[PDB]
């Protein structure tokens, strides 16, 4: 009983148009984003204590 365990690659290599090309695995590339709500909350007329934070 049991099952094999796999590993997710980080870079993929394939032969295209007779030459080898290398790309990143898009399923595992980490990415982030800035929350636009709190970012747009930066009002100058608002209290400085919140603005500096």
């Amino acid at each position: 009983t049991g099952e094999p365990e796999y590993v997710i690659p980080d870079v993929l290599v394939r032969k295209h148009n007779g030459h080898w090309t290398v790309e990143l695995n898009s399923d595992s590339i980490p990415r982030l984003q800035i929350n636009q709500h709190y970012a747009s909350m930066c009002n100058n007329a608002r209290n400085d204590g919140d603005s500096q934070f």
Binding site: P4, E5, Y6, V7
Partner: protein
């Protein structure tokens, strides 16, 4: 389907409530024999080891 020689009569309760009585000669002539095909698959993958 197939063309069958049929009689309309009761036969000892073997066609009671939509039952059908069939001759052995029908079976011996392969008149309602069918062919069924099934598919099986084996996949070889790549592991870390």
């Amino acid at each position: 389907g197939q063309n069958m020689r049929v009689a309309f009569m009761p036969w000892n309760g073997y066609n009671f409530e939509d039952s059908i009585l069939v001759s052995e000669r029908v079976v011996q002539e392969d008149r309602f024999t069918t062919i069924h095909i099934q598919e099986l698959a084996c996949v070889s993958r790549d592991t870390k080891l």
